[PDB]
Amino acid sequence: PRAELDSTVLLTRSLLADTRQLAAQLRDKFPADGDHNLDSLPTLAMSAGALGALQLPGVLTRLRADLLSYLRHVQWLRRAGGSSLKTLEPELGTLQARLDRLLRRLQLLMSRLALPQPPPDPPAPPLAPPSSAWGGIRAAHAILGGLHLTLDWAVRGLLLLKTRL
Amino acid sequence: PRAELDSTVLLTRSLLADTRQLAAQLRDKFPADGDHNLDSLPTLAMSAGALGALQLPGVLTRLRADLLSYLRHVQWLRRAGGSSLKTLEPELGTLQARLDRLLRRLQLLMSRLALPQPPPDPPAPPLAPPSSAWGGIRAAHAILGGLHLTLDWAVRGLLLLKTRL
Amino acid sequence: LEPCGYIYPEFPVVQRGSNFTAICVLKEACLQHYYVNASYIVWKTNHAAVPREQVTVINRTTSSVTFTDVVLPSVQLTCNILSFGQIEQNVYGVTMLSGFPPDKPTNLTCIVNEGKNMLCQWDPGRETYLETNYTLKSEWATEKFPDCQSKHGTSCMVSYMPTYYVNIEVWVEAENALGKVSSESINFDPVDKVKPTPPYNLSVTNSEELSSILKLSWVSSGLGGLLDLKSDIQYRTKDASTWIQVPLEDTMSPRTSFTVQDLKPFTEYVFRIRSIKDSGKGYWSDWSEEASGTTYEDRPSRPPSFWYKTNPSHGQEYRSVRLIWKALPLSEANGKILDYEVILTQSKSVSQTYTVTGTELTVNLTNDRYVASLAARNKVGKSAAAVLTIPSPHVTAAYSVVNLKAFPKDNLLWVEWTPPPKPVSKYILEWCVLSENAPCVEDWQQEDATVNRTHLRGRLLESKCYQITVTLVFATGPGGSESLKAYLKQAAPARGPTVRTKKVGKNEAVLAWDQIPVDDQNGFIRNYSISYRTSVGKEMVVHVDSSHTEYTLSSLSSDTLYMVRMAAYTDEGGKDGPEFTFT
Amino acid sequence: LEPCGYIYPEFPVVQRGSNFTAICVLKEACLQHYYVNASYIVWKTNHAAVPREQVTVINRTTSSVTFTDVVLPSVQLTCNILSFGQIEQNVYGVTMLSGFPPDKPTNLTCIVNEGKNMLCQWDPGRETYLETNYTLKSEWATEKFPDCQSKHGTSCMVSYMPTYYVNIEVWVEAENALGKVSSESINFDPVDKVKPTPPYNLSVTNSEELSSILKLSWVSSGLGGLLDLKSDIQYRTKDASTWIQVPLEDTMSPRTSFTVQDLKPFTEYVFRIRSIKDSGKGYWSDWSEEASGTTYEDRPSRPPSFWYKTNPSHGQEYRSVRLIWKALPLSEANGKILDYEVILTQSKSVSQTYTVTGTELTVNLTNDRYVASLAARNKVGKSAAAVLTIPSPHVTAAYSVVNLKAFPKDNLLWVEWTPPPKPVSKYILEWCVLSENAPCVEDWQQEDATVNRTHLRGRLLESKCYQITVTLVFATGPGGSESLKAYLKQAAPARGPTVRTKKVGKNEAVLAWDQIPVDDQNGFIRNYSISYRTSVGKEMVVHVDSSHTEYTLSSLSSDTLYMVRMAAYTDEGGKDGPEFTFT
Amino acid sequence: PPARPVVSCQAADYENFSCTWSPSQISGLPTRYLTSYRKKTVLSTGPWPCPQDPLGAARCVVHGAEFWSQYRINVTEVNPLGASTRLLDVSLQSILRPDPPQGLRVESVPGYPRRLRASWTYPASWPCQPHFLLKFRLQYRPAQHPAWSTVEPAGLEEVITDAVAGLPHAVRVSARDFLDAGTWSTWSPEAWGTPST
Amino acid sequence: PPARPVVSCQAADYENFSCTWSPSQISGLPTRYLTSYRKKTVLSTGPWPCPQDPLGAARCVVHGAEFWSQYRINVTEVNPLGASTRLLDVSLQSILRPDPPQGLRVESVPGYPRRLRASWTYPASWPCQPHFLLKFRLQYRPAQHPAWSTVEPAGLEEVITDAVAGLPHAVRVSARDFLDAGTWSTWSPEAWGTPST
Ligand SMILES: *[C@@H]1O[C@H](CO)[C@@H](O[C@@H]2O[C@H](CO)[C@@H](O)[C@H](O)[C@H]2NC(C)=O)[C@H](O)[C@H]1NC(C)=O
Ligand SMILES: *[C@@H]1O[C@H](CO)[C@@H](O[C@@H]2O[C@H](CO)[C@@H](O)[C@H](O)[C@H]2NC(C)=O)[C@H](O)[C@H]1NC(C)=O
Ligand SMILES: *[C@@H]1O[C@H](CO)[C@@H](O[C@@H]2O[C@H](CO)[C@@H](O)[C@H](O)[C@H]2NC(C)=O)[C@H](O)[C@H]1NC(C)=O
Ligand SMILES: *[C@@H]1O[C@H](CO)[C@@H](O[C@@H]2O[C@H](CO)[C@@H](O)[C@H](O)[C@H]2NC(C)=O)[C@H](O)[C@H]1NC(C)=O
Ligand SMILES: *[C@@H]1O[C@H](CO)[C@@H](O)[C@H](O)[C@H]1NC(C)=O
Ligand SMILES: *[C@@H]1O[C@H](CO)[C@@H](O)[C@H](O)[C@H]1NC(C)=O
Ligand SMILES: *[C@@H]1O[C@H](CO)[C@@H](O)[C@H](O)[C@H]1NC(C)=O
C-alpha cells in the first residue's frame, strides 16, 4: 500500500498548503483577534511523543473522525455563513471537495490495509446556524485553524506509519 | 382607434411575410406534394364580395377564433411534432410569440372599439399528438398554409374596416 | 457564553462626509468572565486602531466611537477588548459602508441594431461608490417584458425580441442601500429607432454609350424590405480625398440604383453609401464599403502636338522627314490610345496613309510641298486631325518672331515674343542643352496661336545652358526660327578661367585667357576680376567686363616676379582660376 | 382516413455503398378512395423522381424501390401516388441516412494546462458522415466523473478540477446509429501530464566584479511550488540568431537563478527559459519572453593604435607634433572609453601629462628626443600604454623597408614588404589619394611587428590613385619611409589624351601630348594607340608605350590634310581623345 | 381512346377565373367536352357544371370563385372511343395575374432637368377596391441604354430623380396584388418622356 | 506598583519551550517572580507551576509541551507594592525556530570545475525523528560578490551546478520544519570552498 500512503501524504500536503493560504487570506481581509473556538470541533490533545507511539487503527480512526466532522462544519459554513464567505470562493468549495476526495482516499487505504472498517457512526445533529455573519467569520477562523492543525497531525502521523510499513 | 388599426395592419403584414418565408423554407427542405389538411383547422368559405359586406363584430370574432385556434395548433406542433421542427427554429417560436402579440393587440382593439368583448369560449379538447414525425411535417404544411390564408383575409378585412372608420 | 456583545447599528450605511456613531455593548457575563469593563474596549478600523476618538462615559458596559468625515467606502470596524488588560479579544465587527444615493439617470436613449435586441443606455451620474442594480424596466399596455439588468450600469441589452409597431414604455430604476430612484419613462415605438445595417454587394457599372455616367447598384437588407430605406450617396475622384455628396433630395425615396452624371470622361471614382428609414426617423447606418469604377473611355478631345524635322539632304530628290508627336495626356486621350494614323497628302496626288504605334515616323518625302495629317485613334474613334504643311525645301521663311525674350521666373524658364502681323496658326518651340562634349539633343513643345508667352514644359536642369528656338508655323508652313540662350538657374562656375600671358614688357604685361567651357560655366559670366601681386607687394584687383578676352596690366615693376590670379563671376558668385606667374 | 400508407423501414440507416430496399404499402381504403393501385406510386428522392428503378410486382397494394450504391448521406425519400392518375398525392416520407460506423479513436492523449481542466484529444478516424456523440468517459476506483462531451469530436475539456495524485481511468466512447465503439482506456496520474506555464518576471543582473558573468533570475509558478520544476535555458549574443543552450544537466534541479559564464566582456545577450517537472514527466512549458542584459565593461585589452605627425618647422626651437590615435573597437574598448591619457617624457626630465577626449593632440615639442605614451582609460582603468619614441628632427632614419609591393586582391588593396634585418617594434602605414586639385589627405593604420603583409583598412575608392607610404617604427623611432602608387580598382580613363603637333615636315609630323591628369586617369596607363587618316585614305593605327610622351609620324603624304586621333588605355580599356588635324 | 386534354386556367381579377382547353391530339370524331368543377375540403361543395361560353368556345368562366379556396377542374372529352378526363387544381390566390397598368404617361418636371414624372392608372379589369389594391413595379432606362433601373413606387405616381438630362427614357410598369398574391403582370408597353430643359 | 514584566518564549525543539523574563523597570525592592502556565480550551488543564531553573535564573522550561495546543503563560512579580501580571499566549508550532545546521562543508567536485558539493548535519538539538524532519535552505555566492544565490536543497547534500570556476564561494544554510511550522533558523556561519581545477 506504499503507493497509497505516499499518494495520501502528497494529497494531504496539498490540502494543508491550500488551507494555510485560505486562512492567511481570511486573517488579512477579516482581521479577528484572539481565540475563536467552537466547542463542537474535535480537540487534539496528544504529545509529540504520543503520536510516535500510536498504532494504525487509532491513528486512522481519529483522522477520519476529525476530517469528517470538519467536512460537516465546512459545509455548514458555506451554506449558512451567508454573504461574507463568497469572498473566499471558489477556494472554500475547492477545500471541501479535496477534503471529501481525501476522506475517500483514506477509506480506500483502510480497505487496502484490511483493517476493521470504521463504524457507521450515526450523523451528528445539525449544527445550529451561526448567530450572524460575524459569528460566521468567527466560525471560519476556528474551523480553518483546527483543520490546519488536524492536517499537520495527519501528515506527520501518516509519515510515521510509513516508516512502520 | 386609427393608430390601433394601422399598427395592427402592419403587425399582421410582418406576420404574413414571416409565415410565407417559413412556409417556403419548409416546402423546400421537406417537399410534400398535394393536399395536407387538418379537419380541425378553421375553414375560410366566403367570397371576395362577401368580405366587403361584413361588419366589425363578425370580422373580429372570426379573426380572433381563427388566429387563436392556429396558436393552439402551432404550440401543439412545437411540443409534439418532435425532432424535425427544430430545423425551423427559432422561426416557429418567433411566429407563435408574434401571433400571441397580435391576438393581444386585437383584444385591445376590440376594447377600444367598445364592442361586446368576445365570449369566454371553453378550451378546445387537447389535440391528439401526431401519429409520427411525417404526420408532424404534414401538420406543419397544413397549419402554415391555413395561417397564411387566414392572415391574408385578416389584412384585407382590416383594411376594409379602416375605410369604414 | 454567547457573543460578548453586539455593535449598534450592525450595517451602517453612512452618507459620505457625514458623521457616524457606533456603540459596542458588552454583556455583563463577558465582563465578569474577563474581569474588564468597557474602558478596555479597543476600536480598530481594519488593522488601524482608532486613536481614542471613542468615548466610554456612556456606562460601565458601553463604549462609543465617533467618526468625522467618514471617507473610506468600506471599513471593517471591529470592537475588541483587552482581556485582563493584556490579550485583545475580538467582540464584534461591522462593515461600515459609505457612499451616495444614485443620481437619477438622464439621457435614456435606446437603439435597435438591425437583427439584434434593443440596446438602451443612460448617464449613470456621479460615482456612488456602492453597487447599484440599475434595472431597465420595460412594459406595454398588456404585459411587462423581462427586466434587463446592466452588468456595468451604463447599458443593458434586453433579451426579448424588439417589439416593433408597439409603443413600449421603458425606464431605468437605480437602486442602492442609500436610496432608489427611477428615470423618466420614455414612450417610443422601437421601429423608429432601428439602425439599418450598411448596404452590401455595392457594385458599379459604366455606360459604353455614356462615358460621363456610372450606374451604382446595391443590395439593402431592409429587414426583408420591411423598412423603406432612403440612402445618402457620396463619391470622389480616386485621388481626391474630399467626398462629394450626391444631392440628398435625389435619394429621398427607396431605390437600389442611382445614375451619377457629369463624371470625367475617363477617370476612376470611389463610391460609398449609407441608408436610413425613408421617414428619416432613427439613425443613419454606417457607411458601406468603398466601391470603384472607371468611366468608359471617350473620343480624344484634342489632336496631339504635331511637328516635323528634316535632316539636311541637299542633292537628293528625296528628303528623310522625321515626323514626331507627343502622346495625348489622359485628360485628352480620354482612353487607351491604340494607334496614331498619319496621312500624307502630296498636294493633289493620292494621299498616303500610315498607321504608327510609336511617337515618330520617318518618311522619305520628295522635295515637293506636302501636307501632313495626324489623328489619334482610341477604342471609340479618331481624334480631330492635326495638320502640318511641310514646305518644299526651297521655300524661304518670310516671317520670324521679333523681340524674343526668355527669363527664369518661379523656378521656370519662361519665353515671350511678339506675334507677327500675319495670323499664326500655331507656335512650335524647341530647345537643347548647349554643350561642347555632347550634341544638341532637341526637345520641343506646341503652343496655340493665341499664346504669346509660355514656360518650357520639360525637365530643365539648373546650371545648364539651354539654347532656345522659336519657330512660327503658318498655313504655308514654318516661319523663320529665332534663337537665343538662357539658363533656368545659375551657379558659380565649376572652374575659374585659365590665365596666360600674351606679352610681357619692362612695366606691362598683356594677359590672355580662354573663355570657360560652356559645360563649366554654370551661368551668365558677367565680369572677371584679375588679382595680381608680387612676393611682397599688396595684391591689386582689376575688374574686367566678361566681353573682354585680354587685359594689359600696367605700371608693373621691372625685373619683378608677379603672381596673377583670375576669377570669373556669375549672378551667383564666381570661381577662382589657377594661379599664374610671370616675370 | 388514416395516412394512406407507411414506408418500411421508417428510419433506414444504410451502410454507405451498400444496397437498400424500401417498400411503400397503401391501405385498401386509400386505393378505393383515390381509385388507384400501387402501380401509380411515384418515388422521389427529395425533388428528384426515381427513374423507375422501383418494381411493383409485389402485389396490388405494394411498391418497392431498390437503390444501388446509395451515396447521398441524407435523402428525403417520399412515396407519392398519382391520384386518379393525375394529381400526385404524398403518402409518406423517410429520411434515408447513410454513413459509416465510427472508427475506434486512437492516440487518446490528455494534457493539463496549469490552472485549467484536463484536456484530452483523439484521432476521430475516417469521416462518418453521421453525428457521433464522442463521450470522454472518466472514473477512478470510487467514483465516475461527469461525462465530458466534445462539441467537434476531437477534444473535450472536462468540467471537474484535475484530480491530481489519483490514477484516473479515461476512455472515449464514440456512438452513432450504425454502431458504438470505445477507445482503449488510458490509466494515468494527471499530475504527470501537467504543462507548466512559462517562467515570468525573467530578469538579468551583471557582476561589476565579473564582466564575464550574468546572473539570470526568474519566478516560477510551480503551482505554489507544488511541482519541483527543472528548466532549460538558452541564450545568444543579441546579433546571433543561433540560440546557445546551457548544458541541460546543469539545470536538472529546482532553481530560480543560474550564473552564465564565459560571456564576452562587454556584449549584449538575450536569454529565454522554459520549465518542466523535475522528473521530466509531462511536457516542457512554452518559452518565456526574451530577457536581455549587458556584461559589465572591462579594462581595455589592447592599447590604441598610436602615431605622430610633424609639420616641418625648420628654424624653430619648438615643433608642433600632432599626436593621433584611433579609438579602440568595442572588442578592445570592452567598455565606455571615457578619456585618453597622453604622457610625454623628455628623456630624463619630468614627464608631462595630458588628458584628451579627442583622438588627436597637438603639442609644441622642442627639438629634443621625446618618448610619447598613450593609454586608454575606461570606467575600470587604463589600458596598457602605447609607447612611441619621437626622434629628434636631426636623427636620420637608418633603415627602410625593401621590396615593397602593393596589389589589389579580393577587392582589397594589399601591401607587402620584407622586414628589415633589425627587430621592428611595429609598422605604420599611411596613404592618401593622389590628386592635382586637392591635397594629400593622409590616412593611416598600425601593424604589429610580426605582420609583413596587410590590407589597407579604409574606405578606399575605385578608380582613384592612392599614394601608399610605409614607415618602420623602431625603439629608436621611425625608420625610412618607402612609398609607391597603386589602385584598388581601375577603369577606362575619364578623358582621352590631347594631341598637339610639335613639328611638321614634308613627309613627317612630330606629335606631342600631355599626360592625362591623375584626377582623370582611372587606372595605370599601359599604352596609347595613335590613329591618323587623310580625308580619303585608310586609317592607320600605331601603338605607343605609355612611358613615351611624343611620337613622330613617318611616311606621310606631302601637301595632305591629316586627321589624328589618340586614345589612352588602362587594364580596363581606354578612352578616345579629341580629334586633331594638321596639314 | 382520346388522350388527356390539355387544360389551363387564368384569373384576370380577384373574383372570376377562366379555363381553356384543347386536345392533345384530335380524335378525328365528333367529340363533346364535359366540364365541371368542385370545391375541395377535408375528406354546397358538389360538382357544378361550369358555364361554357354560349359561343360554343372551349372556355368556362367560374363566376364568383372562392378566393382563399382550392377548386378541382374536371374536363372530360367524351366520344365513341370512351371518356378521357383532365383534372386540374386551381386557386385564384396563386393563378391570379393582373392585367398591365393602362395609360402610362411620362412628363418633364419643370425646373428639375434631372427628374421625370411617371403616372398611370389601375387596369380597368381590376376594380381596385381598397382591400384589393395593387402594388406596381416600374422600370426606366435611356432610349438606347438597355439596362433597366428598377423601382417599386407607392401609388400611381413616381418621380424619377436620376433621369439623364435630355435623354429620352422609356418607362414600363407591372402590377401585383399588394399582398404579393399571384404573380406580376406582364410589363406595360414602353412610354417615352424627355426631361425638362 | 511594579510595571508589567517583559516575557518572551522560544522553542529550540518540537517538545520543549523555554520562557525568560525581566522587569520593565527595577522596583528597587526584594521582588519574587511567581510563574505559571495553563492549557487553553473552550470556555488535566489547570495551572501548573513551571519549573524554574534551580540556579535561580529568570527562566522556566516547559518540558513535554503539547505541540498543537495553545498555552497561556502567567508571570507575576509579587512584592510589597502589589502583584503585576504578564499574560502571554504561546504555541510551539508558531514560536518554534530550529537551531542553525551544524558542520557545513563545501568540497570541490572532481572533474566538474563548475560544481561544488555542500553537505551539513541536522542540529544536535533536533533529534530528527522521521515525522519531524527539517527542510533546509542554502545560499551561495562568490567571496567578494555579495548577491546570494538561493536554493532549497532536499536532504543534507546539494551540488551547486553553477559555481564560478576557481572563485571561492561562501555557503550558508538555514533550517525549518518540513511542514513550514515555526520560522527559518538563523543562517549558519559561512563556509569556504573552491571549485576543482
Ligand atoms: C369527371 O367528370 C366525368 C364526367 O364529366 C365523370 O365521369 C362520370 O362519372 C360518373 C360517376 O362515377 C359515372 O356515372 C359516369 O358514367 C361517368 N361519365 C363518363 C363519361 O365517364 C368523372 O367521374 C369525374 N371525375 C371526378 C374526379 O370528378
Ligand atoms: C366577374 O363576374 C361577375 C359575374 O358575372 C361580373 O359581374 C357582372 O359584370 C357585368 C359586366 O360588367 C355587369 O354588367 C353586371 O352587372 C355584373 N354583375 C352581375 C350580377 O352580372 C363581373 O363584372 C366579372 N368581373 C369582375 C372583375 O368582377
Ligand atoms: C496569575 O498568577 C497569579 C499568581 O501567580 C494569580 O494571582 C492570584 O490569584 C488568586 C486567584 O484569583 C488569588 O487568590 C491570589 O491572591 C492572587 N495572587 C496574587 C499575588 O495576586 C493570578 O490570578 C493569575 N492569573 C491568571 C489569569 O491565571
Ligand atoms: C526536552 O525535555 C526533556 C525532558 O527533560 C528532555 O529529555 C531528557 O533529556 C536529557 C538530556 O539529554 C536525558 O538525559 C534524559 O534521559 C531525557 N529524558 C528524561 C525523561 O529526562 C529532552 O532532552 C529535552 N530536549 C529535547 C530536544 O527533547
Ligand atoms: C448603557 O448605555 C446604552 C446606550 O445608551 C444603553 O443601551 C444601555 O442600556 C445602558 N446600560 C445601562 C446598564 O445603563
Ligand atoms: C474600569 O476599571 C478600571 C480599573 O479597574 C477603573 O479605573 C475604571 O474606573 C473602570 N471604569 C468604569 C467605567 O467602571
Ligand atoms: C393497376 O391499374 C391499371 C389500370 O387500371 C392496370 O392496368 C394494372 O394492371 C393495375 N395493376 C395492378 C397491380 O393491379
Author numbering:
A (entry chain D), B (entry chain A): 35 to 199
C (entry chain C), D (entry chain F): 25 to 607
E (entry chain B), F (entry chain E): 112 to 154, 164 to 317
Question: Which statements did the authors publish about this structure?
Answer:
The signalling receptor gp130 represents a paradigm for differential signal activation and functional diversity. It is required for interleukin (IL)−6, IL-11, IL-27, oncostatin-M (OSM), leukaemia inhibitory factor (LIF), ciliary neurotrophic factor (CNF), cardiotrophin-1 (CT-1), and cardiotrophin-like cytokine factor-1 (CLCF1) signalling. For IL-6 and IL-11 cytokines, gp130 signals by homodimerization of its intracellular domains. Similar to IL-6, IL-11 coordinates gp130 homodimers by forming a hexameric signalling complex comprised of two molecules each of gp130, IL-11 and co-receptor, IL-11Rα.
To understand how IL-11 instructs unique signalling outcomes through gp130, we solved the structure of the IL-11 receptor recognition complex by cryoEM. Complexes comprised two copies of the human IL-11 cytokine variant (IL-11 fused to domains D2 and D3 of IL-11Rα) and two copies of murine gp130P496L mutant (D1-D6), in agreement with a human IL-11 complex which came into press after submission of our manuscript. The final map was refined to a reported resolution of 3.1 Å using the gold standard FSC 0.143 cut-off; with local resolution ranging from 2.6 Å to 5.4 Å. IL-11 is a helical cytokine that coordinates a hexameric assembly with two copies of IL-11, IL-11Rα and gp130 through interactions at three principal binding sites. Site 1 of IL-11 is formed by the hinge between domains D2 and D3 of IL-11Rα. In our complex IL-11 residues T77-L90 are at an interface with IL-11Rα and adopt a helical conformation. A comparison with the crystal structure of apo IL-11 shows that these residues undergo a conformational change upon complex formation. We observe that for the IL-11 complex, the sidechain of IL-11:R135 at Site 2a inserts into a hydrophobic groove created by a hinge between domains D2 and D3 of gp130 (V190, W164, F169, Y184, I192, murine numbering). Here, IL-11Rα:R235 forms a salt bridge with gp130:E273. In the IL-11 complex, the Site 3a is comprised of a series of electrostatic interactions (gp130:K68-IL-11:D67, gp130:H71-IL-11:D62) and pi stacking between IL-11:W168 and gp130:Y116.
